[PDB]
Ligand binder design. Structure first.
Ligand SMILES: CCC(=O)N[C@@H]1C(=O)NC(=O)N=C1NC[C@H](O)[C@H](O)[C@H](O)CO
Ligand SMILES: CCC(=O)N[C@@H]1C(=O)NC(=O)N=C1NC[C@H](O)[C@H](O)[C@H](O)CO
Ligand SMILES: CCC(=O)N[C@@H]1C(=O)NC(=O)N=C1NC[C@H](O)[C@H](O)[C@H](O)CO
Ligand SMILES: CCC(=O)N[C@@H]1C(=O)NC(=O)N=C1NC[C@H](O)[C@H](O)[C@H](O)CO
Ligand SMILES: CCC(=O)N[C@@H]1C(=O)NC(=O)N=C1NC[C@H](O)[C@H](O)[C@H](O)CO
Ligand SMILES: [K+]
Ligand SMILES: [K+]
Ligand SMILES: [K+]
Ligand SMILES: [K+]
Ligand SMILES: [K+]
Ligand SMILES: [K+]
Ligand SMILES: [K+]
Ligand SMILES: [K+]
Ligand SMILES: [K+]
Ligand SMILES: [K+]
Lengths: 147, 146, 150, 148, 151
């Protein structure tokens, strides 16, 4: 059970259908664990996630970062994903808070659809990341001060 | 977004494309009720983060604009690495959205097509400004207000 | 140096993605620990490798050494690279922030076969879980000798 | 313009002496043209040694120019040396709030490095370019910072 | 390299042990440069792998003017090579800037064993990166000594 944990979810909006599916999977895991109302924030792109995740981390036991980065024609994909990786890792360690990475980094749109948790998808990384965030928050709760 | 304080730092390497990105940035700003954002010019993309850091002390959002085109050497990779590392750090250090409108392309054609010129497919300068403003407004709603 | 280490406080954080291989790594870690006079190290489980650094950071506050264990296998997307980047960045930062050895027993493989071959199963060529724990304990003992003791 | 008041430091590595001296020559010439006859010039052995010296120079200078030549060899060592320089200089710049200009050449061949050093027959001078970059940014930050 | 005194500089050497023969050769080259510069007894610490270097380098940096990092990373079958070298790069660069101390990189990052042998300073090797890194550390420590507060 994870009813006591304060969960935040930050989801980017670039590729709306896939982003909403990831968020759907996140909210479903949250509600299944006894959390009907997690803090849900929307940002435009994946680069905007870390700075919002940092704000959310000040008031929550866990933050789920959700987004979809699909490779285009330029090397820009690599550096967007690099920024997200660097940002979320820093935010997690700065705040000592699990920042779960449900940010899809795919070569094609099909690969992103297949990992969003749609009807015919093979997996749901939005669901997976929320499990990851909540379990780590509960683990840290057991590791931290409680008399 | 009339209340948000916006700064724009744009490098100058590849002037035509950099001015187009800045044009797209200014137009989004003005459309959102911001006629005069703080606009600073730097020479290259490596010079952006340290100026972005200065601008972040006095602004709710900073838009980083620039054009990095791959040449003959691996130098492209390390310039883009420095920008990525710098802007990400600045954003988290200052708790300020630092939007990345810095183009990282293989060819000049790809950069032109993403600058927002008459025949361009997209305007990344415009997109970055929307990104910066929306995140600044989001953080304003998330932060202290009684 | 795997010979002595009874006084060292050891933590082991192991992710769970690819359970069989993760348990094998943890098995190798626990066996090295027990052989060095440490029957009860702090063992924490996390879901994925991304979750390791923040737990490793917590464990580093009250342990002389932390062993990070996990299995990252390349899939269809570039996601593999960025997961491994986050772990690398995270563990390196945690080690230097806390001045504590954070041993990397996180497998970073192209295929499942390569991960199985490095977990320390019956037929495996090596055990990276065992290797990382030797690495963590030896470094903790080294730092103990380098640090203040009158 | 008028960069006479800015305090400039130049740190140049020594690995590939001819090319490193050419980069330094271009740096010194831009400096002198901007009204700075005597910038602080420090030499280091390799490019890895630059950031820690750049950090020291940054405490007492408005701008630091990092100069060096990294040419790819037989091993992946090239990538990690350039990674360290990139990481180091970017950190130093933001730690000190000081422009640390990157005039460190990262080339596949020696010809490419020669062509970017500002020798008689070179296509460009990255040592000159980096000094312009450092000075302009230092002047920009001076205008952005406190002055009543 | 024996040309200046370097007698006053406090030198630490941290060398990993993975690939013992090559690591000992790098250390040999390091100690010989040190002794030639008037330093018979530098602080020498051994670690198991290259990932263990930065945290020990950090400790050594607290009471030495220069630290030489020595090690051998040879590419295997997996991408693990890249991430080990990334960690060392990140770690040593951070430690150097945190402590304001030259942390010389004599950590070999090679595709084959032959390439590592050729850069260790063995009888038939083309170069000695252990020797080169110690020269690099000592020269930078002397340079920083001249740049810092004195008198
Ligand atoms: C591959 C790059 C691309 O075409 N689109 C990416 C993308 O794939 N996914 C995304 O969320 N945001 C993007 N770009 C927006 C970016 O995250 C920022 O919002 C922007 O750089 C301004 O900061
Ligand atoms: C591919 C590299 C190149 O030829 N030019 C790049 C480039 O593509 N784009 C850019 O904005 N600045 C550059 N170089 C200038 C650089 O950002 C710095 O100003 C320079 O390193 C000095 O600090
Ligand atoms: C190639 C990526 C993949 O398909 N699975 C990896 C994997 O191979 N190993 C792993 O431990 N965790 C994974 N993913 C989960 C990840 O570590 C985090 O739990 C997730 O990003 C939520 O924070
Ligand atoms: C990797 C390519 C190479 O063979 N040599 C490079 C190089 O190309 N350029 C350089 O300045 N220094 C090097 N190596 C020395 C390095 O910068 C440090 O001085 C050394 O690692 C000690 O820390
Ligand atoms: C990646 C190639 C490999 O198979 N082994 C390398 C290697 O080549 N060299 C090395 O010194 N240490 C290794 N591995 C050990 C590593 O440095 C750490 O000790 C380990 O990850 C525990 O922290
Ligand atoms: K928190
Ligand atoms: K407890
Ligand atoms: K601000
Ligand atoms: K609020
Ligand atoms: K500790
Ligand atoms: K002692
Ligand atoms: K300064
Ligand atoms: K002013
Ligand atoms: K020191
Ligand atoms: K002095």
């Amino acid at each position: 059970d994870a009813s006591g944990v304060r969960l935040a979810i930050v989801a980017s909006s670039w590729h709306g259908k896939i982003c909403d599916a990831l968020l759907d999977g996140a909210r479903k895991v949250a509600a299944g664990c006894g959390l009907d109302d997690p803090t849900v924030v929307r940002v435009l792109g994946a680069i905007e996630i870390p700075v919002v995740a940092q704000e959310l981390a000040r008031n929550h036991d866990a933050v789920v970062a959700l987004g979809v980065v699909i490779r285009g024609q330029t090397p820009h994909f690599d550096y967007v994903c690099d920024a997200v990786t660097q940002g979320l890792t820093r935010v997690s360690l700065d705040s000592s808070t699990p920042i779960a990475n449900g940010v899809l980094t795919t070569n094609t749109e099909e690969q992103a659809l297949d990992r969003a948790g749609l009807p015919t998808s093979a997996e749901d990384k939005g669901a997976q990341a929320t499990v990851a965030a909540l379990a780590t928050a509960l683990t840290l709760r057991e590791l931290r001060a409680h008399s």
